[PDB]
Amino acid sequence: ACDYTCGSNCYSSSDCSTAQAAGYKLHEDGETVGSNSYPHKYNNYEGFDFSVSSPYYEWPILSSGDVYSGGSPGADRVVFNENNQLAGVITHTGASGNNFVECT
Ligand SMILES: Nc1nc2c(ncn2[C@@H]2O[C@H](CO)[C@@H](O)[C@H]2OP(=O)(O)O)c(=O)[nH]1
Numbered sequence: 001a002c003d004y005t006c007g008s009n010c011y012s013s014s015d016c017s018t019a020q021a022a023g024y025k026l027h028e029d030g031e032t033v034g035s036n037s038y039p040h041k042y043n044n045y046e047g048f049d050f051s052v053s054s055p056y057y058e059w060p061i062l063s064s065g066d067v068y069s070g071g072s073p074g075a076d077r078v079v080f081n082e083n084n085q086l087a088g089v090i091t092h093t094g095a096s097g098n099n100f101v102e103c104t
């Protein structure tokens with residue numbers, strides 16, 4: 001079974017931890033990868049009910065299981081905060097234009 005389902009993509013907790021650790025390390029070193037500069041602040045325009053505190057940062061999580069290194073980011077993202085806590089897993093899949101919806 002999937003811990004998080006983003007559209008057709010199935011993710012386990014380990015996938016999220018792996019993705020988060022990569023994004024968080026870049027954040028701490030003050031570096032970004034990709035033309036969209038990940039990781040970067042997530043403003044929560046959608047108004048999701050994140051239990052943990054801000055600031056939030058979005059980092060792409062890939063369906064292939066590979067850690068993002070600069071190419072196409074895809075539709076899925078892990079959102080983490082300043083204390084290295086997972087705020088949530090979101091996706092552009094099933095959402096209008098550039099909006100996000102939560103992964104179930
Ligand atoms: N939908 C959405 N985009 C955000 C948010 N915070 C920052 N962004 C950025 O605002 C712009 C319009 O969505 C994009 O550059 C998007 O970045 P990404 O495309 O890198 O996710 C947010 O809370 N929601």
Ligand SMILES: [Ca+2]
Pocket residue numbers: 010011012015065
């Ligand atoms: Ca996996």
Ligand SMILES: [Ca+2]
Pocket residue numbers: 064065066
């Ligand atoms: Ca692989």
